[PDB]
Amino acid sequence: APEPWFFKNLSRKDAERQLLAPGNTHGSFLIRESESTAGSFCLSVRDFDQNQGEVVKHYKIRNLDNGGFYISPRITFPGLHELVRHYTNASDGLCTRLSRPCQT
């Protein structure tokens, strides 16, 4: 099930541009590999800000010793799919609720 929200090869800059492109809106997101840490991922989400407005925010997805994933140590997940579904249901600390995957 090749997940639409997973962009393997895509830099931090690419993600911001791709997300800010026409067709995407508030809550659009994508998960990419981190540039700082090889083997980890980042969640890039498009949020509506007060000043300039349209901005892209990046969250680090940290790995658990047993194989899980989490953004905040308070809620962990057995995989990326579950992390995406959880934040799609409720922002739960995130800048905004995850909505529709990034469109090209």
Ligand X SMILES: CC(=O)N[C@@H](Cc1ccc(OCC(=O)O)c(P(=O)(O)O)c1)C(=O)N[C@@H](C)c1ccc(OCC2CCCCC2)c(C(N)=O)c1
Nearer to ligand X, 1 or 52 (CB): 52
Shortest CB 51 distance to ligand X, Å: 15
Cβ–Cβ < 8 Å for 88, 99: yes
Nearer to ligand X, 60 or 85 (CB): 60
Look up residue 18 and give its two tokens: 């791709």
Contact residues for ligand X, defined by CB under 6 A? 12, 34-36, 42, 57-60, 71-72, 93-95
Shortest CB 58 distance to ligand X, Å: 4
Nearer to ligand X, 94 or 98 (CB): 94
Shortest CB 34 distance to ligand X, Å: 4
Cβ–Cβ < 8 Å for 86, 76: no
Please provide the DSSP assignment of 71-94 as one string.
SSTTS-BSSHHHHHHHHHH--TTS
Cβ–Cβ < 8 Å for 44, 30: yes
